[PDB]
Design a protein around this ligand. Sequence first.
Ligand SMILES: Cc1ccc(C(C)(C)C)cc1S(=O)(=O)Nc1ccccc1C(=O)O
Ligand SMILES: Cc1ccc(C(C)(C)C)cc1S(=O)(=O)Nc1ccccc1C(=O)O
Ligand SMILES: Cc1ccc(C(C)(C)C)cc1S(=O)(=O)Nc1ccccc1C(=O)O
Ligand SMILES: N[C@@H](CCC(=O)N[C@@H](CS)C(=O)NCC(=O)O)C(=O)O
Ligand SMILES: N[C@@H](CCC(=O)N[C@@H](CS)C(=O)NCC(=O)O)C(=O)O
Lengths: 226, 220
Amino acid sequence: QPKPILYYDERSPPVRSCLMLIKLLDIDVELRFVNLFKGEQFQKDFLALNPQHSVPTLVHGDLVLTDSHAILIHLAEKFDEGGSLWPQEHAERMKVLNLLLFECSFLFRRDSDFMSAIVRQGFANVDVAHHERKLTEAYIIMERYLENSDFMAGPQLTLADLSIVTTLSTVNLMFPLSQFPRLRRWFTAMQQLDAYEANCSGLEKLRQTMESVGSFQFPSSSAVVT
Amino acid sequence: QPKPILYYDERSPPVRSCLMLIKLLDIDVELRFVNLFKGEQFQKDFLALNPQHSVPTLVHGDLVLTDSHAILIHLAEKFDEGGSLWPQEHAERMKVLNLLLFECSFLFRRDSDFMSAIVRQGFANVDVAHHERKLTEAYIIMERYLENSDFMAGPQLTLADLSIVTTLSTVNLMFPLSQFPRLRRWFTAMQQLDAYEANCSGLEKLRQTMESVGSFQFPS
Ligand SMILES: Cc1ccc(C(C)(C)C)cc1S(=O)(=O)Nc1ccccc1C(=O)O
Ligand SMILES: Cc1ccc(C(C)(C)C)cc1S(=O)(=O)Nc1ccccc1C(=O)O
Ligand SMILES: Cc1ccc(C(C)(C)C)cc1S(=O)(=O)Nc1ccccc1C(=O)O
Ligand SMILES: N[C@@H](CCC(=O)N[C@@H](CS)C(=O)NCC(=O)O)C(=O)O
Ligand SMILES: N[C@@H](CCC(=O)N[C@@H](CS)C(=O)NCC(=O)O)C(=O)O
């Protein structure tokens, strides 16, 4: 019954969500670095493990998970059994699942589109206003989700907050949260959590890498700093 | 308990996955059509319900689900407790979940990218070779997933097959499966399912609407 193995590159927001859960729950996990900027995700053995050539990838015994949201759910069920991060009551759990899928299908997709365009085209050649519209629309949606509750999926911290805060912090490197009071209040609260320390290093490394590869600077005024 | 309400436009592959499960499980639902090509997902009451302005959206009592994969899991858990579609064993369930997320993050994302490019740019201006690459890569991955099993997540049909097949068939409007023996056999087998009837109307409607909006004709 070996301990979980996490193939990771901390610059990835989804990776940082798993790192946050691992810290929060004090899970002993072996970390194996896969440098996405060097193309190590295309190494023959890693491609054999995960044809999607993506991180995070978790190997836990015979189970191989290739999506951060399955990893969060699996680790919560194995190490937060009966807990509130992945709540027990069906309706509450479905709400968390719904927000995890929002992060996958909407927030991360749009941030990935924007950041991938910077890498492929160079910042100066990206239609920044187009991506500002796409990502501001995500801000609007999250502000709507927090108008009803202090956390994304209810009155208390869940996997949904861990998944969303890492990508939110990455989007906020570029786009300010000035017009989004509930989102700012939530993001500030998330930054006070001990587990949020697992987000800081990879976010800074991503900032450095993006500014280098994209030949630009994020506006220092955008990022919320607590 | 009030019956579930499904807001839908059957051109949507993820909508069609939910329609297939509803047929598979004989679920009594109220369907409410939201015409995506008239922008009805932006009607004030629907945005109020789903800020993502997306279908499928399920309202089941007080629970509002805004993603097909949550809808599939929810409906399987209410209406198919003890079935093989959403297996009870943890390892098997995680495998199904992992494949559902592949459909969302990889297969559907790339098909959505391609279809979106048609609408934004016009078919005649789409870099078809680029999207043929991204999507053939998805075919390659699914062919590998099928190495050991008859179905995407194992020896039996699961929610993962329902989610993947609808998007597959949409990709297959443009890109054939002749070079993927496992994938083609799997798709043919899926097409024999009684529940696959739920995919037929929306797939044909999507082709027809895409061809007017794209001002082209799919090679199929
Ligand atoms: C952003 C990005 C672009 C391109 C790459 C390659 C080197 C693989 C081409 C890697 C990354 S990344 O390592 O920084 N990861 C992400 C981080 C934030 C948002 C999206 C992504 C993403 O990969 O889609
Ligand atoms: C409420 C409940 C009761 C019993 C079960 C078992 C069949 C495991 C006994 C599972 C659940 S559940 O609603 O809490 N389950 C998930 C939802 C989404 C994604 C994964 C799961 C999961 O069960 O792993
Ligand atoms: C019916 C319709 C109307 C309007 C839209 C826009 C949002 C593009 C204006 C999309 C659709 S659609 O339901 O046909 N859309 C997809 C179909 C197949 C694969 C992916 C998609 C997708 O929307 O990403
Ligand atoms: N939905 C997936 C997204 C995984 C993903 O796209 N990871 C990126 C980094 S953020 C990656 O590994 N890219 C490597 C590649 O695509 O080649 C998840 O939540 O894990
Ligand atoms: N991951 C989501 C994707 C939902 C989605 O993107 N639906 C499309 C149709 S395929 C839609 O409703 N588009 C309308 C819009 O975004 O305005 C799911 O599986 O439900």
